[PDB]
Amino acid sequence: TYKFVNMREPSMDMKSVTDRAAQTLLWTELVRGLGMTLSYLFREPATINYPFEKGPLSPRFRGEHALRRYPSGEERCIACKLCEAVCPAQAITIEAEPRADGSRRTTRYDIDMTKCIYCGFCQEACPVDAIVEGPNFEFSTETHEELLYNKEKLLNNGDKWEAEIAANIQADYLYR
Amino acid sequence: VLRLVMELSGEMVRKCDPHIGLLHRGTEKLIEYKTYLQALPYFDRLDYVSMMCNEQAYSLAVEKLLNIQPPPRAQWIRVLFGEITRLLNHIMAVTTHALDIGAMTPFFWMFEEREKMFEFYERVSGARMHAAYIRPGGVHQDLPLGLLDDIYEFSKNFSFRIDELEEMLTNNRIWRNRTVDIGVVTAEDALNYGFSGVMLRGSGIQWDLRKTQPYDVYDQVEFDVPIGSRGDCYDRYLCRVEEMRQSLRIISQCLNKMPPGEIKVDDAKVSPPKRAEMKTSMESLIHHFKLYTEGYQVPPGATYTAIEAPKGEFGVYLVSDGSSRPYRCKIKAPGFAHLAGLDKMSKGHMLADVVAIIGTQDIVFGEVDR
Amino acid sequence: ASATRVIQLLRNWASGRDLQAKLQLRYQEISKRTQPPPKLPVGPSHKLSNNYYCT
Amino acid sequence: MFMINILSLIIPILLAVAFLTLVERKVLGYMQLRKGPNVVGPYGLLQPIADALKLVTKEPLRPGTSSISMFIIAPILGLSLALTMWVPLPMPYPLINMNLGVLFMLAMSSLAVYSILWSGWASNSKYALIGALRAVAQTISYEVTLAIILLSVLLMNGSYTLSTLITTQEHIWMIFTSWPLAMMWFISTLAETNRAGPFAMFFMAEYANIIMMNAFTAILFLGASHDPHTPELYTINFVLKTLALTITFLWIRASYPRFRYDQLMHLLWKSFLPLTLALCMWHISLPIMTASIPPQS
Amino acid sequence: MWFEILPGIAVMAACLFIPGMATAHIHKFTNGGKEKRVAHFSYQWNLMERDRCISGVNRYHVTKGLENID
Amino acid sequence: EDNKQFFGRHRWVIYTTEMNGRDTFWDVDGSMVPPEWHRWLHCMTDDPPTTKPPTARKYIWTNHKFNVSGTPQQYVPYSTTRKKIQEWVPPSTPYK
Amino acid sequence: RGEYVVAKLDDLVNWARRSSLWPMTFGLACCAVEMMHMAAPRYDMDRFGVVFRASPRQSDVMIVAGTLTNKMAPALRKVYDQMPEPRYVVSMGSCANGGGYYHYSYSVVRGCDRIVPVDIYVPGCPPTAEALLYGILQLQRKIKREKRLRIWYRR
Numbered sequence A: 001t002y003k004f005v006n007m008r009e010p011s012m013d014m015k016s017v018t019d020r021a022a023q024t025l026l027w028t029e030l031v032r033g034l035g036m037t038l039s040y041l042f043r044e045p046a047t048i049n050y051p052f053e054k055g056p057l058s059p060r061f062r063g064e065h066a067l068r069r070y071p072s073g074e075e076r077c078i079a080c081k082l083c084e085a086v087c088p089a090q091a092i093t094i095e096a097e098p099r100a101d102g103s104r105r106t107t108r109y110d111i112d113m114t115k116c117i118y119c120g121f122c123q124e125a126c127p128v129d130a131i132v133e134g135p136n137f138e139f140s141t142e143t144h145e146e147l148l149y150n151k152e153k154l155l156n157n158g159d160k161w162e163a164e165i166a167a168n169i170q171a172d173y174l175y176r
Numbered sequence B: 001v002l003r004l005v006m007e008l009s010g011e012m013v014r015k016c017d018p019h020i021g022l023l024h025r026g027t028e029k030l031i032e033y034k035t036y037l038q039a040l041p042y043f044d045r046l047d048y049v050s051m052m053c054n055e056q057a058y059s060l061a062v063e064k065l066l067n068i069q070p071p072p073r074a075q076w077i078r079v080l081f082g083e084i085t086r087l088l089n090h091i092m093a094v095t096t097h098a099l100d101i102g103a104m105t106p107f108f109w110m111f112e113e114r115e116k117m118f119e120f121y122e123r124v125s126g127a128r129m130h131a132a133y134i135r136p137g138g139v140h141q142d143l144p145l146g147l148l149d150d151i152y153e154f155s156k157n158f159s160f161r162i163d164e165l166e167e168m169l170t171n172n173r174i175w176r177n178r179t180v181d182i183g184v185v186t187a188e189d190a191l192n193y194g195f196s197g198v199m200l201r202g203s204g205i206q207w208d209l210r211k212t213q214p215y216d217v218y219d220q221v222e223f224d225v226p227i228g229s230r231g232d233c234y235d236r237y238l239c240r241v242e243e244m245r246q247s248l249r250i251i252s253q254c255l256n257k258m259p260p261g262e263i264k265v266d267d268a269k270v271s272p273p274k275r276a277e278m279k280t281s282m283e284s285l286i287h288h289f290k291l292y293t294e295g296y297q298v299p300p301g302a303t304y305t306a307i308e309a310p311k312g313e314f315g316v317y318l319v320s321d322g323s324s325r326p327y328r329c330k331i332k333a334p335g336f337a338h339l340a341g342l343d344k345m346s347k348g349h350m351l352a353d354v355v356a357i358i359g360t361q362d363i364v365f366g367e368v369d370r
Numbered sequence C: 001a002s003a004t005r006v007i008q009l010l011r012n013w014a015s016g017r018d019l020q021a022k023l024q025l026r027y028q029e030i031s032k033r034t035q036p037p038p039k040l041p042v043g044p045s046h047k048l049s050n051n052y053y054c055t
Numbered sequence D: 001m002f003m004i005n006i007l008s009l010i011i012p013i014l015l016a017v018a019f020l021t022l023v024e025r026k027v028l029g030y031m032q033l034r035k036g037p038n039v040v041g042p043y044g045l046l047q048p049i050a051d052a053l054k055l056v057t058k059e060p061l062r063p064g065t066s067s068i069s070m071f072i073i074a075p076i077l078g079l080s081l082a083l084t085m086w087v088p089l090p091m092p093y094p095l096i097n098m099n100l101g102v103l104f105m106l107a108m109s110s111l112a113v114y115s116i117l118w119s120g121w122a123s124n125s126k127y128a129l130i131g132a133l134r135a136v137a138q139t140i141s142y143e144v145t146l147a148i149i150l151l152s153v154l155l156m157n158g159s160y161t162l163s164t165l166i167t168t169q170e171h172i173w174m175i176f177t178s179w180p181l182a183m184m185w186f187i188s189t190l191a192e193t194n195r196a197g198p199f200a201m202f203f204m205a206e207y208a209n210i211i212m213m214n215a216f217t218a219i220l221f222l223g224a225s226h227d228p229h230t231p232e233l234y235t236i237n238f239v240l241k242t243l244a245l246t247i248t249f250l251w252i253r254a255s256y257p258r259f260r261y262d263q264l265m266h267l268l269w270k271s272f273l274p275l276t277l278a279l280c281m282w283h284i285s286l287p288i289m290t291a292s293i294p295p296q297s
Numbered sequence E: 001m002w003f004e005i006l007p008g009i010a011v012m013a014a015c016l017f018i019p020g021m022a023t024a025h026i027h028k029f030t031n032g033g034k035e036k037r038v039a040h041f042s043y044q045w046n047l048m049e050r051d052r053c054i055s056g057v058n059r060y061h062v063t064k065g066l067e068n069i070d
Numbered sequence F: 001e002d003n004k005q006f007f008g009r010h011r012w013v014i015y016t017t018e019m020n021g022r023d024t025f026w027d028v029d030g031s032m033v034p035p036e037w038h039r040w041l042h043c044m045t046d047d048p049p050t051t052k053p054p055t056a057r058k059y060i061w062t063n064h065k066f067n068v069s070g071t072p073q074q075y076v077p078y079s080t081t082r083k084k085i086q087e088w089v090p091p092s093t094p095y096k
Numbered sequence G: 001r002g003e004y005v006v007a008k009l010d011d012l013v014n015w016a017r018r019s020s021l022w023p024m025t026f027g028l029a030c031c032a033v034e035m036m037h038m039a040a041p042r043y044d045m046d047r048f049g050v051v052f053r054a055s056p057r058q059s060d061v062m063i064v065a066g067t068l069t070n071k072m073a074p075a076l077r078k079v080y081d082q083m084p085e086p087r088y089v090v091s092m093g094s095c096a097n098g099g100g101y102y103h104y105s106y107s108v109v110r111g112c113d114r115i116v117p118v119d120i121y122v123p124g125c126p127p128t129a130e131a132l133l134y135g136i137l138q139l140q141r142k143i144k145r146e147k148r149l150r151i152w153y154r155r
């Protein structure tokens, strides 16, 4: 099924041509534009007062990363290395060697912000929900080097955006 | 990013050379070195106007090779967001055209609306654009509770927002004389120049992928595509505007009868196991482990299957090597076919109106340059 | 929406249309930002019998 | 004493032109679902000053190909002639009560083409010269409509003395008698105003021109009343009328797409001009036909 | 909503108001109440010159009447 | 907060005069928001950190920092790994 | 005082340089959506004194948005040279600031800073509209942290 658009067959009667002639002579479609715009003017705007108020987001929002930790403070990361095995931009580099207490956990977790895509494949790839996409986005920096994250930066953001992330992952694990 | 270099026989133009390539990222070249899942956001970055529709093409393409069909529920969500992209694209298409002409207000009413569906993308996937939602096997996550009602409220009010877009452009004699009798393309030239989508629809040719070969679940939905008479940039403008009105009903039909069921195919070899299932089932861990290292192995073969993206006939031609990685995926795009006829398209017209021809062509430098 | 009746009647004349019926800025009619937890349905092949991969 | 008035005719306008930029953005704000500048002072009141204060602090990047002589002279006249425009305006009692103020008004409006032509020619850039070539052709094209329209309406006033305009209207706004010419003039002043480093001065000039041309229409058609014992009443009425017309300049500047070049001349020569000729013919026969020819003195 | 344009236009309104205001009053100040007698033709000019010469203070705007003749 | 104002301006913040040893005045940005309140202010949860606070743990930061970019307390990238190889240390024997 | 007068003048000179600076684009890729999707009514930037305008001779800051290919590299450099002083560039998007997705491909320079002296980096793929609005806010605050006339007087 389909419908036409352009075809109109404007009737050539005396009354109809009067409206067309009037429209051309005394502009009416243009004044319609003025009426529509003026009606727009007398309407409260949609602008948001940043930073005093910022637009809505979702519990699934993908932003600056953070390496989370268990209830007692243990690193959730175990260097299973799944995250960079699926990182589409290869922004994740991981190395692991022995830890003092017999463990051999990770040492290096550098997600290059200037390489990362924020697709969120890493947090889905993680089997222990170690790396997550945090809610924060206001981390603009004036040095390219700052966005190059390291293990300590990731862990600090995990301790900074902790309560918010914990609530989000508690409000979203049923969907996932 | 457009390097239009072109000749001025006075003020009259005889040949326009669109030196495309200014944004050329060898997307298919990088796709050769990533698995199917990793290559998915590349398509998401192809048409950064109607992004989720590009996921649609890549998904069914990999579904076709895998001989796996999406679950019925996931089929209906995809068309819901597929038409939202249609709403996304035509809103950008009409206004940027109007922005090129000199119309400013239509640009900002419609781009005020664009936030609402971008906000919907946030609730469903987690990003404003580049959702990475539609994947082989259906969709990643399920719809958040209450989202269906929210899009219903937006849709129930959106037909009102179209009227002003029509009221001050369709009737405006200024918009007419700046958009009619330009970019006129005869039917056979449109078809044989490789044009796709609206150029076919605008020029009077009765053809649409969504109806002639209804993919996904477009079978159940019913609507009417707006083929016009002349096919100039004005006629395509009505086709664009009417498509948003058409997309509104398509949104309605899927909305009121969304089927119940799973969001991903019950095939752990192709769909990642659920997080709750991941931490209890030994197979779930194994399947999830290898799926995020190498991914599903796609049987050999090759398909081109295309969808009716709002840009036009958008298809991907991937060849499988029999492993968990693609061999080569030619990024067929409506824009490249769209722009291929630009030499004729700007023929017989001057600069100030062939810029209107650029607007109606819906050219975006992520489908062509990749 | 806030706006007294004189504003509403003024724009309803300039537009010629009822803008009050459907406005372009969302109000409390939207779903609550916090929502009840979901219980998404089980897999269509979740049966533990007659569900071998060979079929 | 006279020097005070000349400054008193220039300084408040320059402040008004400065605050026109804030008006231009913000009246288009809520007419765009926008708010307009509100962070720079209360309701953006400091935005007029801020933009007029940061532009001068920027270095005047002039290309070497550009001749410094013309590149400076052309902007200079673009304001100076646009500043004497305000002078013969019949604001209660005009500054210079020229017996031929209408010619003085229109003739100086004919020299605003030189600012664009030279500043475009001196730039020595392919984009620049065609833009200057386009602008000069358009403005001189609408010049003939500008003068013919004036001749028609002014015929019922009595003489080119701008001071006589208030007496002519008095009881009835002259838009009532020449409304077919009124919209003819309003489109014409839009086209001439080019409105559908050493730059803040140019923008101020092209914005002072918007206010005056709107004021010229206000004194022409949208008349008022003048009590000799209380000229302030005429002041408030006059500024309010020209303010509304300036608002309309902003109203339509955010309500229409642009005009293609061919239609830009098609509208004038093949539609506006022949209709203007007939209306001028109507407006000369009618005073004779009705014995209502106004007195020259 | 829109009532915030009024602070934007009010400054221009007052700014546009001063020129007509300033011309209205200093003419009264310079010409002592009466407006500066407009001379659009020769008659009004030589009317003014006769007034200036008859004033004695060499000022047209000073007017002398029936008290000036005895 | 508010219910009258349309979605996107119903809740909002006026910032403090001084926070974290940094003056908060004529200049202010969005990073001042503590992580617990980042949810409610962004309409990711109807209920705010009042009523029911979030959970309490030892390792959560005692106070939320601001954006430390362009300041002496910036972030610096560095290698967290250890030097793989070590040179052959030459004995300092008297000689020969 | 001698330092006080140069202090007041310095503030006045740069108080509105952070409020009247007007952004400039090149709009390469999907970051060109948020480029002007912020000019949309929701996250209004015209209120912040900034307003998008190409006019390469008459703009303050350019928000480099999109993937920087080698083929365009001359075009950006000639634009930045034609850019008047003071001038700042903002790298919006992972691709612009550091290559992002295509960092390993042959036809994109790895980051814009390899081509232009790059000011505040706003991350995102794409940066959600307010993230650059936050980034633009940081740029204006950086403008306050300037001692232009103070340094000149010290010399």
Ligand SMILES: CCCCCCCCCCCCCCCCCC(=O)OC[C@H](COP(=O)([O-])OCC[N+](C)(C)C)OC(=O)CCCCCCCCCCCCCCCCC
Binding pocket: A024, A025, A026, A027, A030, A031, A034, B173, B177, D179, D180, D181, D182, D183, D184, D186, D187, D221, D252, D256, D266, D267, D270, D271, D272, D275, D282
């Ligand atoms: C006894 C009575 C004697 C006198 C009677 C006179 C005859 C009756 C009246 C005749 C018609 C009215 C006069 C002519 C007006 C139209 C002229 C014309 O060419 O029209 C067609 C033209 C062109 O119409 P078109 O594009 O459809 O083409 C017409 C035909 N050709 C192709 C030949 C040109 O219309 C316009 O130009 C429209 C306006 C374009 C500019 C954009 C801004 C418009 C702003 C409008 C709102 C503001 C209005 C402000 C008014 C003043 C306020 C102080």
Ligand code: SF4
Binding pocket: A076, A077, A078, A079, A080, A081, A082, A083, A084, A094, A125, A126, A127, A128, A129, A130, A131
């Ligand atoms: S973040 Fe998760 S997936 Fe990545 S190495 Fe650590 S435990 Fe493995």
Ligand code: SF4
Binding pocket: A083, A086, A087, A088, A089, A090, A091, A092, A111, A115, A116, A117, A118, A119, A120, A121, A122, A123
């Ligand atoms: S979100 Fe970033 S780090 Fe995680 S998988 Fe995607 S690209 Fe890699």
Ligand code: SF4
Binding pocket: B045, G029, G030, G031, G065, G066, G067, G092, G093, G094, G095, G096, G099, G100, G101, G124, G125, G126, G127
């Ligand atoms: S950073 Fe992301 S959104 Fe921006 S250009 Fe690169 S891929 Fe596109």
